[PDB]
PDB file of C-alpha atoms in Angstrom:
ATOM      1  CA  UNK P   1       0.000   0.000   0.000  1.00 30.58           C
ATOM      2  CA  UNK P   2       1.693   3.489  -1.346  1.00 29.13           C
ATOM      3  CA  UNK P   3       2.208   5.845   1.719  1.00 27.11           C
ATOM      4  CA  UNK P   4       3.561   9.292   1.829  1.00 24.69           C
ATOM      5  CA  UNK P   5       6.931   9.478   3.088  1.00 24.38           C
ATOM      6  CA  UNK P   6       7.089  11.432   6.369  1.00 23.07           C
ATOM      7  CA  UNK P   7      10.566  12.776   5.151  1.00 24.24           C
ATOM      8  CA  UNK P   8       8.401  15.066   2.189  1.00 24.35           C
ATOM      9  CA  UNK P   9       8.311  18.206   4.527  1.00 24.99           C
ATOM     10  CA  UNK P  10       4.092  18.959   6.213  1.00 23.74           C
ATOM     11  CA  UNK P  11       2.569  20.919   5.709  1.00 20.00           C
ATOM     12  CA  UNK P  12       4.592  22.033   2.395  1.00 19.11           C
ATOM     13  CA  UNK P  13       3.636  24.831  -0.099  1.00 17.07           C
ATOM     14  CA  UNK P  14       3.744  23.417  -3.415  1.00 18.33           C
ATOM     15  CA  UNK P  15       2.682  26.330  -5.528  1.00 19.10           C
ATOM     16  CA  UNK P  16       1.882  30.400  -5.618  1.00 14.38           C
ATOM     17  CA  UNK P  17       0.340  32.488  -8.051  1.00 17.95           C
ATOM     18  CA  UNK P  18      -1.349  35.924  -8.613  1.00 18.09           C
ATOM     19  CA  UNK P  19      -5.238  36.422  -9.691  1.00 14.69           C
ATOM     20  CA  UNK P  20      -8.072  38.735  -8.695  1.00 12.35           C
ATOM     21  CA  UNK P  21      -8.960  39.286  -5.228  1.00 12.32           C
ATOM     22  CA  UNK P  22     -12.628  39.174  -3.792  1.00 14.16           C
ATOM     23  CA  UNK P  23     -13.579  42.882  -4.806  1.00 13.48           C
ATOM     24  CA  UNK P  24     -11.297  45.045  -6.966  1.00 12.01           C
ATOM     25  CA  UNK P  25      -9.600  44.845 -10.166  1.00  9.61           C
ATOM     26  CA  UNK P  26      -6.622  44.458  -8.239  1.00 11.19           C
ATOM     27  CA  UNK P  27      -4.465  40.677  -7.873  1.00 14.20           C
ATOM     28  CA  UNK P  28      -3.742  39.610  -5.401  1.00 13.27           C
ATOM     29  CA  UNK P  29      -1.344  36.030  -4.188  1.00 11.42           C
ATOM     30  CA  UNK P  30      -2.974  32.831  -3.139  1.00 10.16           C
ATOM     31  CA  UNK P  31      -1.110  29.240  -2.557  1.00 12.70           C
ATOM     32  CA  UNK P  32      -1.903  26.015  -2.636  1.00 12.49           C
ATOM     33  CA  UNK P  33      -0.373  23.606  -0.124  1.00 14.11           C
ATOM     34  CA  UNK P  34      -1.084  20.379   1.928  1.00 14.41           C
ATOM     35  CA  UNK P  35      -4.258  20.328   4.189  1.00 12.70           C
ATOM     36  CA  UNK P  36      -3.443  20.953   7.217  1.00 16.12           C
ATOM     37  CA  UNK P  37      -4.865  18.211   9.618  1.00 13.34           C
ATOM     38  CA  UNK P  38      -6.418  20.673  12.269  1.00 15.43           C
ATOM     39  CA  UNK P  39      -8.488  21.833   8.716  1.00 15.03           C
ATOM     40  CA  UNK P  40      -9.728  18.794   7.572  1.00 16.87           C
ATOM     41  CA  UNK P  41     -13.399  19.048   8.748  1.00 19.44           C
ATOM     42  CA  UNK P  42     -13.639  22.405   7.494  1.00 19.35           C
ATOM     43  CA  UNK P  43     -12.357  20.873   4.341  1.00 19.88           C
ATOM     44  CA  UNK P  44     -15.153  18.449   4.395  1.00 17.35           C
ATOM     45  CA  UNK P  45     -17.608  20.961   5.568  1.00 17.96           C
ATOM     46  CA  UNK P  46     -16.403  23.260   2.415  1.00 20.83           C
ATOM     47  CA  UNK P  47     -16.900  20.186  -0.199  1.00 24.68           C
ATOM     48  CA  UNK P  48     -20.428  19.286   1.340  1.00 25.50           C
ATOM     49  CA  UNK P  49     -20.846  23.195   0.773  1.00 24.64           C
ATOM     50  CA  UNK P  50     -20.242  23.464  -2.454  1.00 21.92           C
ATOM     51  CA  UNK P  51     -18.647  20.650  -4.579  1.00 20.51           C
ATOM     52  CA  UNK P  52     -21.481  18.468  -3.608  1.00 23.36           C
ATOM     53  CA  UNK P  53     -23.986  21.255  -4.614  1.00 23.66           C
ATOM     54  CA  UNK P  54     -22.628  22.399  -7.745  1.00 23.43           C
ATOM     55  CA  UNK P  55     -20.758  19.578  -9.500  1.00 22.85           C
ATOM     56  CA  UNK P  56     -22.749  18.235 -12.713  1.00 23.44           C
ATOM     57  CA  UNK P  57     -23.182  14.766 -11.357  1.00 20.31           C
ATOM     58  CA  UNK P  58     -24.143  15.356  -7.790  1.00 26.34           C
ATOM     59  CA  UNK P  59     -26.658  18.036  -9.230  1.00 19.43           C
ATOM     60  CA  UNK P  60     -28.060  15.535 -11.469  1.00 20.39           C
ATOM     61  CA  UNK P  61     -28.433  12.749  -8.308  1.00 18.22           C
ATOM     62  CA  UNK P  62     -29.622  15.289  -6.333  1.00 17.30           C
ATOM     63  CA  UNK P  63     -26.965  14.315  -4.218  1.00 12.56           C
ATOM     64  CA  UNK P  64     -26.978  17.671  -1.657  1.00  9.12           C
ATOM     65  CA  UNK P  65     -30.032  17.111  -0.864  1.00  8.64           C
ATOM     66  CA  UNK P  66     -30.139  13.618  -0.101  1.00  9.80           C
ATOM     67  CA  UNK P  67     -28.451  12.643   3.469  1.00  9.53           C
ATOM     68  CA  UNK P  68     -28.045   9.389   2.856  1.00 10.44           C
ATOM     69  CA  UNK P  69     -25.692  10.024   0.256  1.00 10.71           C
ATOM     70  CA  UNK P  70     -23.831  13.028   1.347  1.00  8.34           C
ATOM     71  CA  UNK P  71     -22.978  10.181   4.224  1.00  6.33           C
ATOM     72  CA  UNK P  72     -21.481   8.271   1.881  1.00  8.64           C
ATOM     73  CA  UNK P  73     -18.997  10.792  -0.018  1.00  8.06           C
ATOM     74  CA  UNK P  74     -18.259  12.382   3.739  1.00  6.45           C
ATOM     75  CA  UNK P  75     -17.386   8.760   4.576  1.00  4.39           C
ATOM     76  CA  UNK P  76     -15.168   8.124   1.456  1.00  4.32           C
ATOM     77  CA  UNK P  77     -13.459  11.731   1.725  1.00  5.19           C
ATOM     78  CA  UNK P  78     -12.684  11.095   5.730  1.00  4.16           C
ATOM     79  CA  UNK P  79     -11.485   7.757   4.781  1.00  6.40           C
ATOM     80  CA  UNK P  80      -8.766   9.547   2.234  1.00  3.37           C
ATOM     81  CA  UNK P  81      -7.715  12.400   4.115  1.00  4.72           C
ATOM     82  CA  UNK P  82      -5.284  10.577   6.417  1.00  4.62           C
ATOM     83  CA  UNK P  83      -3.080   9.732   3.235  1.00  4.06           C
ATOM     84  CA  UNK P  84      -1.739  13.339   3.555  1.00  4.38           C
ATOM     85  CA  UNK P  85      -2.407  14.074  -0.117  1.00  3.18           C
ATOM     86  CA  UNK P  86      -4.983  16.425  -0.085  1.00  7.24           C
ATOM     87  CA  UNK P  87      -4.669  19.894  -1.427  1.00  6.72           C
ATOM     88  CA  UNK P  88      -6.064  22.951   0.031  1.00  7.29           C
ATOM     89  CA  UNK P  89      -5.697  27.149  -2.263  1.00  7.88           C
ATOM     90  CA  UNK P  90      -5.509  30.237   0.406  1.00 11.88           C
ATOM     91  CA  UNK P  91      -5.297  33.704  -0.148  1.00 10.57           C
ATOM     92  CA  UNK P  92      -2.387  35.573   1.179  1.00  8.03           C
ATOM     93  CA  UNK P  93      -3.850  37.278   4.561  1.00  6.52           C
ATOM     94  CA  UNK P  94      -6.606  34.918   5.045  1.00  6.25           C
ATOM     95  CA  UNK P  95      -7.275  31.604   6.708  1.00  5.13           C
ATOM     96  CA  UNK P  96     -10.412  31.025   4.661  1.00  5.86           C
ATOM     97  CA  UNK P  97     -11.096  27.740   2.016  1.00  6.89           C
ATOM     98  CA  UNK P  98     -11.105  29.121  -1.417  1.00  5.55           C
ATOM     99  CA  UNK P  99     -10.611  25.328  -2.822  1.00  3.42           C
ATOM    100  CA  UNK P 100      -9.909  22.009  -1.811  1.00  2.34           C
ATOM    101  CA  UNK P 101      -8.862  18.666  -3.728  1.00  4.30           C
ATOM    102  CA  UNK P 102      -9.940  15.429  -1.703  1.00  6.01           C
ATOM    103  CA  UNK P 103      -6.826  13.488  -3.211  1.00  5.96           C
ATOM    104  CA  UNK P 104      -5.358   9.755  -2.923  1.00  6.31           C
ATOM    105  CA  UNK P 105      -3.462   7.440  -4.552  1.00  5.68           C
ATOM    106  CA  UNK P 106      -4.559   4.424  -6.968  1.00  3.04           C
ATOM    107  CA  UNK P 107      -2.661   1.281  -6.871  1.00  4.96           C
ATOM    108  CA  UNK P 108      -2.481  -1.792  -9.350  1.00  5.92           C
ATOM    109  CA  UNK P 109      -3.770  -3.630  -6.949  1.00  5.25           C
ATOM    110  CA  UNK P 110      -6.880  -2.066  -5.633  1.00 10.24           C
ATOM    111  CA  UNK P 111     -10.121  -3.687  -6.205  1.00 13.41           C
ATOM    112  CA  UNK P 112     -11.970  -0.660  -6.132  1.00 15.50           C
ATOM    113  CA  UNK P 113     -15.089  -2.441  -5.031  1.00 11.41           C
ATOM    114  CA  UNK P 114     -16.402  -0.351  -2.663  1.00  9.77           C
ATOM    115  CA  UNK P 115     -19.970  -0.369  -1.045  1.00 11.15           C
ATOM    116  CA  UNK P 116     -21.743   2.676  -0.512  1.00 13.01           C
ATOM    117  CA  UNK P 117     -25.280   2.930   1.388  1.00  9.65           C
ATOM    118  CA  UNK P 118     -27.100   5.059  -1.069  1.00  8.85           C
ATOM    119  CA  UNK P 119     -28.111   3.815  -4.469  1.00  9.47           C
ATOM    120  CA  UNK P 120     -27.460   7.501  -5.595  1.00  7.62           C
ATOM    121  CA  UNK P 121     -23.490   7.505  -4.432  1.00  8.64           C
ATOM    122  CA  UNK P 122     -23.263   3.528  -5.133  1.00  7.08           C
ATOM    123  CA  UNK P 123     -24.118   4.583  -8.966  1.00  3.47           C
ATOM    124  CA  UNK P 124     -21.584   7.638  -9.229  1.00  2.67           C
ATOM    125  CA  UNK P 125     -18.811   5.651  -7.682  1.00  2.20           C
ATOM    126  CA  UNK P 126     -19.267   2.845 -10.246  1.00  3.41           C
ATOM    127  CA  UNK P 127     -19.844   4.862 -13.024  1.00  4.62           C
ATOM    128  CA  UNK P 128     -16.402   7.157 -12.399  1.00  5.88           C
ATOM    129  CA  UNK P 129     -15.008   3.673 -11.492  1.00  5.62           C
ATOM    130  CA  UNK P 130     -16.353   2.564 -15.222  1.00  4.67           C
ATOM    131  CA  UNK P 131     -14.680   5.313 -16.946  1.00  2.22           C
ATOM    132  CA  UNK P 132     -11.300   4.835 -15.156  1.00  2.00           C
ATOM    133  CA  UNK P 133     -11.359   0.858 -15.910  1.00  2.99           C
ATOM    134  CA  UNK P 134     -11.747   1.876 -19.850  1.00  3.57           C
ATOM    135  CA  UNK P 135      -9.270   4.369 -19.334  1.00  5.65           C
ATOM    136  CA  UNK P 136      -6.730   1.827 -18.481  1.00  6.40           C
ATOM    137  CA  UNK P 137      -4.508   3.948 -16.665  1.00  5.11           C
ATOM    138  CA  UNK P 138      -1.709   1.731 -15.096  1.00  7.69           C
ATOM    139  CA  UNK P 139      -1.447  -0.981 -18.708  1.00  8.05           C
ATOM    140  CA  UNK P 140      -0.802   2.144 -20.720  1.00  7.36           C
ATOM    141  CA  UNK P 141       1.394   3.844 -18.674  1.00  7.34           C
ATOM    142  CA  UNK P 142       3.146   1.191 -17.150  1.00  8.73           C
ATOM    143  CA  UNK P 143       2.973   2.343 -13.867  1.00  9.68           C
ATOM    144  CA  UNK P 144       1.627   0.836 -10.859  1.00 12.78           C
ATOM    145  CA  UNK P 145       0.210   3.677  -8.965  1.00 15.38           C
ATOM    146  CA  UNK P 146      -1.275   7.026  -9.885  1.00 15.98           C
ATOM    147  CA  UNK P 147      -2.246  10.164  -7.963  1.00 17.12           C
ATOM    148  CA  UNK P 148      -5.907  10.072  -7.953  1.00 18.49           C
ATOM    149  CA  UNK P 149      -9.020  12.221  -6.696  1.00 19.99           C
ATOM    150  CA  UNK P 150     -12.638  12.579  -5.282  1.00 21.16           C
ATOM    151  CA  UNK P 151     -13.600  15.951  -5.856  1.00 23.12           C
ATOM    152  CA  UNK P 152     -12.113  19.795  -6.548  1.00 25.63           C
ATOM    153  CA  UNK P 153     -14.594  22.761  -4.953  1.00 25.74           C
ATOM    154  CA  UNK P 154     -14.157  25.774  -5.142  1.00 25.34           C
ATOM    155  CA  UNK P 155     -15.998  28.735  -3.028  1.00 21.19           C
ATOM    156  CA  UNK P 156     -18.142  30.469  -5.695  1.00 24.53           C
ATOM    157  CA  UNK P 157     -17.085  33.810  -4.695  1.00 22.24           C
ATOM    158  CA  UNK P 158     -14.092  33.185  -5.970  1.00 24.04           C
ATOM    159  CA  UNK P 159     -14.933  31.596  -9.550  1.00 23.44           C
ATOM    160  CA  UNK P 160     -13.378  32.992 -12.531  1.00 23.55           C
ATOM    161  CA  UNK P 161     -10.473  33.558 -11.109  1.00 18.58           C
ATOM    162  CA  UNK P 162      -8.644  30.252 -12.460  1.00 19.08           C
ATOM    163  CA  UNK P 163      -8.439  28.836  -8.941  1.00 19.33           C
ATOM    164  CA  UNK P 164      -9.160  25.223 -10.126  1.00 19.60           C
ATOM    165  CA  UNK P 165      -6.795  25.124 -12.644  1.00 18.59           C
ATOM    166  CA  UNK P 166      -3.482  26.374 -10.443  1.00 18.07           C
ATOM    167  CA  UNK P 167      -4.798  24.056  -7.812  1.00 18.52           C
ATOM    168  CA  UNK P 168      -4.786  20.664 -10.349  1.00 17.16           C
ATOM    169  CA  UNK P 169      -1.085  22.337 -11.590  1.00 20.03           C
ATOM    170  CA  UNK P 170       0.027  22.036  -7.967  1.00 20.73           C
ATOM    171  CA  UNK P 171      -0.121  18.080  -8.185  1.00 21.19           C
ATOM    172  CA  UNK P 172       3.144  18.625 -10.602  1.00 18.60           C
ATOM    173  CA  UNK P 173       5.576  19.467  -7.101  1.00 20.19           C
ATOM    174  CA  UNK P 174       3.746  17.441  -4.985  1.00 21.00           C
ATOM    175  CA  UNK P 175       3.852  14.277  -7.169  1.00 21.01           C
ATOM    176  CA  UNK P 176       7.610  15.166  -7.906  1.00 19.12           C
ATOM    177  CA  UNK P 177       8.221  15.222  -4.181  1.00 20.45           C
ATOM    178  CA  UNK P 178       6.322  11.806  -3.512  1.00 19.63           C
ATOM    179  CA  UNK P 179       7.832  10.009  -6.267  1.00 17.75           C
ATOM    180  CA  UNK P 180       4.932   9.703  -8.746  1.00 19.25           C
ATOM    181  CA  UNK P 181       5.512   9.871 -12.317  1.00 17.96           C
ATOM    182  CA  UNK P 182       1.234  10.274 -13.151  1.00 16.21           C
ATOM    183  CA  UNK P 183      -1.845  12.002 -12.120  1.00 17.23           C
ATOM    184  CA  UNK P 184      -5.287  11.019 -13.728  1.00 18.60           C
ATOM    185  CA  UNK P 185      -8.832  11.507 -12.964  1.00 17.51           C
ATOM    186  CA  UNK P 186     -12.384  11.319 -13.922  1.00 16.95           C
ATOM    187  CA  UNK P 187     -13.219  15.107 -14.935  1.00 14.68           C
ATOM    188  CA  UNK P 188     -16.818  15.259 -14.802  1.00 10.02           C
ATOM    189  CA  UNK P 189     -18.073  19.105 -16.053  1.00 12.17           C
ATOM    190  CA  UNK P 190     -16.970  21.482 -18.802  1.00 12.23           C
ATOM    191  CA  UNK P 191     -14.656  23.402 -17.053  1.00 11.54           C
ATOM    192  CA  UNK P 192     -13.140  21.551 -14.496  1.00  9.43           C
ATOM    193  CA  UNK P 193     -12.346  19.202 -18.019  1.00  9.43           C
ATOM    194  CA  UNK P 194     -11.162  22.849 -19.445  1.00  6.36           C
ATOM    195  CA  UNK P 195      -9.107  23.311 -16.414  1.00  6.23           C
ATOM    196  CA  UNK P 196      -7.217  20.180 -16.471  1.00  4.94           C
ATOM    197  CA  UNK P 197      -6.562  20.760 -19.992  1.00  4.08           C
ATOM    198  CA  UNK P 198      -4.757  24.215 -19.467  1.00  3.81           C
ATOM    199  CA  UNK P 199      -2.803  21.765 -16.655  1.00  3.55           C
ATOM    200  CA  UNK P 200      -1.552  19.687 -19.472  1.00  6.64           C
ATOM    201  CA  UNK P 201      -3.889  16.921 -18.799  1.00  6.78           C
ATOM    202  CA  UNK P 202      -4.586  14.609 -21.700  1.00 10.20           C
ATOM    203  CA  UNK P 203      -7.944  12.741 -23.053  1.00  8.59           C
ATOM    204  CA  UNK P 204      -7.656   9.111 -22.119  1.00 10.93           C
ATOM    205  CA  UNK P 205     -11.285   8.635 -22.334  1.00 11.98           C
ATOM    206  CA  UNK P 206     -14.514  10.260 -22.950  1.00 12.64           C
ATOM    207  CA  UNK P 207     -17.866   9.221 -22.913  1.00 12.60           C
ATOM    208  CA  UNK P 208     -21.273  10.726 -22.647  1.00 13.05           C
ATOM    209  CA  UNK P 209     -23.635  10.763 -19.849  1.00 13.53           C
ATOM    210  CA  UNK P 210     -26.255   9.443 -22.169  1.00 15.82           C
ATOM    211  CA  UNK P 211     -23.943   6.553 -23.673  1.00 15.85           C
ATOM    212  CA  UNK P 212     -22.797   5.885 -19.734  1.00 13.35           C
ATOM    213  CA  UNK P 213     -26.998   5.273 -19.368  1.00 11.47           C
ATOM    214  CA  UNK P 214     -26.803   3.293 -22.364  1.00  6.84           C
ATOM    215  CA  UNK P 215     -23.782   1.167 -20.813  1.00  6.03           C
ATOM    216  CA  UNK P 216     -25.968   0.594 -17.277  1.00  7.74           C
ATOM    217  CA  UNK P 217     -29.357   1.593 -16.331  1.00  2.75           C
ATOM    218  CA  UNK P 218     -28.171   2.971 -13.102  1.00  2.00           C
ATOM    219  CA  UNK P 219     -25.569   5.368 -14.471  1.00  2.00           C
ATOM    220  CA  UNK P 220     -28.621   7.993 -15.521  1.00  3.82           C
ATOM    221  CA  UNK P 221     -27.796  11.811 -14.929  1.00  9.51           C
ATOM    222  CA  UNK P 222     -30.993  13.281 -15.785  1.00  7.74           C
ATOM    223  CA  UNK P 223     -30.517  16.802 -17.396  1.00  7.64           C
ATOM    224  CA  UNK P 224     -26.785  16.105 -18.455  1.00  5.32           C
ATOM    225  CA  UNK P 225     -27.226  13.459 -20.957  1.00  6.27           C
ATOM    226  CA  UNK P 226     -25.104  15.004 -23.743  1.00  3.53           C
ATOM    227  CA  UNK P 227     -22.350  16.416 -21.343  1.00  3.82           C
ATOM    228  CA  UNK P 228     -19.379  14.520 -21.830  1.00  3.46           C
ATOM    229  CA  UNK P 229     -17.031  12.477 -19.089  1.00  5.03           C
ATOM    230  CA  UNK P 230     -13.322  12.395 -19.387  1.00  2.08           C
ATOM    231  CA  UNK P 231     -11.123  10.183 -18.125  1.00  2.00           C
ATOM    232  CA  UNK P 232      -7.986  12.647 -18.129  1.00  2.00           C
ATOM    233  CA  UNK P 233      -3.895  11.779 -17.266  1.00  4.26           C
ATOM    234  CA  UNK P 234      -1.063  14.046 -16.681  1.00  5.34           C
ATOM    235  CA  UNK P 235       2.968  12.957 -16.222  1.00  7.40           C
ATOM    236  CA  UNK P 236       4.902  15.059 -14.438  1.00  4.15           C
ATOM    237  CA  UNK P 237       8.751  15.425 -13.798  1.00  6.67           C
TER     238      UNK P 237
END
C-alpha cells in the first residue's frame, strides 16, 4: 500500500500564483499547499458546501439534498484524508477555504469495489469507477500507482479567477516530491475538463452521460445526458 513518506516536509507549499482578489480589479497572491490536519473538517464541511452542490453529477443525483448520500462521499473523503495528499488554495492574509482537492493514490492492486449505502453515491462511484477501468490507466502507462481524486470545490465567490486550474497544476511538485511519475482523474463538467486541460492533462477517455446510461441503467444523470465524461492523465517530472 503506497504511503507518503514522512521525510516530504508537512505541511509544504507546493505552488503560488497571482489572480483577482474578492472585490477590486486588483491581484492579489494565493497558494496552494497540503491540508493541514487541524483543517480537515472544514475541508469536508467546504466540499459538502459546495462541490457536492454544484458539481454536474451530484446536481443531477440530487446528491446535496439527499443525506443518505452526502454520508457516503463524507465517509469516502474522511477515509482519504489521512493519506496526507490532499490539497487545500488560500489567499495571502486569510485563513479562509477558497478550494480544496480530496486526493489519494490508486494502486495496481486495488479492487476498487467499494460499497456505498445510497443507491445515488453507489451509482456515481461505479460509473467514475467505469470510466477509469476503460481508461486503463496503469497498462498504458506502465505504472503501478497514480495520484488520484474525489472531488475539486471551489468557493463560488471566488470563480473565474482560475483557482481550479493552479490548484490541479500544484499536483506537478507534490507528485515530484512523492515520487509519482502520473496524475489522472475522472473530470466530470466542462470546465473543471477545461481546467485540467490548461494543466496539461490529456484525453484518455470520454464518454457521454447518455452513452454511460446506455452502458448501465443505473448510471442515468438526468438533465446532463449530452455532457461529456473524461477520463484525463497528466505525467509530471
Amino acid at each position: 500500500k503506497w504511503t507518503r513518506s514522512v521525510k516530504v516536509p508537512f505541511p509544504s507549499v507546493w505552488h503560488r500564483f497571482q489572480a483577482k482578489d474578492l472585490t477590486s480589479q486588483q491581484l492579489v497572491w494565493y497558494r496552494v499547499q497540503d491540508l493541514p490536519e487541524d483543517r480537515f473538517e472544514d475541508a469536508i464541511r467546504h466540499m459538502c458546501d459546495y462541490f457536492a452542490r454544484d458539481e454536474l453529477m451530484n446536481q443531477a443525483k440530487g446528491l446535496a439534498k439527499d443525506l443518505v448520500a452526502m454520508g457516503d462521499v463524507v465517509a469516502l473523503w474522511k477515509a482519504m484524508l489521512p493519506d496526507r495528499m490532499s490539497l487545500v488554495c488560500f489567499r495571502e492574509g486569510s485563513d479562509e477555504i477558497v478550494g480544496v482537492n480530496i486526493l489519494d493514490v490508486a494502486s495496481r492492486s486495488d479492487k476498487d469495489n467499494a460499497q456505498f449505502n445510497s443507491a445515488i453515491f453507489q451509482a456515481i462511484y461505479d460509473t467514475i469507477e467505469y470510466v477509469s477501468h476503460q481508461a486503463n490507466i496503469f497498462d498504458r502507462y506502465n505504472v503501478d500507482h497514480y495520484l488520484n481524486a474525489m472531488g475539486l470545490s471551489v468557493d463560488p465567490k471566488y470563480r473565474g479567477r482560475g483557482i481550479a486550474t493552479e490548484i490541479l497544476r500544484a499536483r506537478i511538485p507534490l507528485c515530484r516530491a512523492v515520487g509519482l511519475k502520473l496524475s489522472a482523474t475522472c473530470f466530470t463538467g466542462p470546465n473543471s475538463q477545461t481546467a485540467a486541460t490548461r494543466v496539461g492533462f490529456q484525453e484518455d477517455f470520454t464518454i457521454t452521460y447518455g452513452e454511460l446510461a446506455r452502458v448501465d441503467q443505473r448510471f442515468n444523470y438526468p438533465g446532463i445526458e449530452e455532457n461529456f465524461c473524461k477520463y484525463m492523465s497528466l505525467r509530471v517530472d
